[PDB]
């Protein structure tokens, strides 16, 4: 299991 926290440029 991996947790993620950030941003993406598009959905």
Ligand X SMILES: O=S(=O)(O)c1cc(S(=O)(=O)O)c2c(/N=N/c3ccccc3)c(O)ccc2c1
Q: Which residue has the tokens 């440029």?
A: 9
Cα–Cα distance measured from residue 10 to residue 6, given in angstroms and rounded to the nearest whole number? 13
Cα–Cα distance measured from residue 3 to residue 6, given in angstroms and rounded to the nearest whole number? 10
Tokens of 11: 């959905």
| 5 contacts ligand X (rule: CB under 6 A) | yes
CB of 4 to ligand X, least distance (A): 6
10 binding partner (options its own copies, ligand X, none; Cβ < 5 to 8 Å by kind):
its own copies
Chain residues 1-11 in contact with its own copies, contact rule CB under 8 A = 1-11
| 7 contacts ligand X (rule: CB under 6 A) | yes
């Amino acid at each position: 299991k991996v947790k993620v926290w950030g941003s993406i440029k598009r959905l």
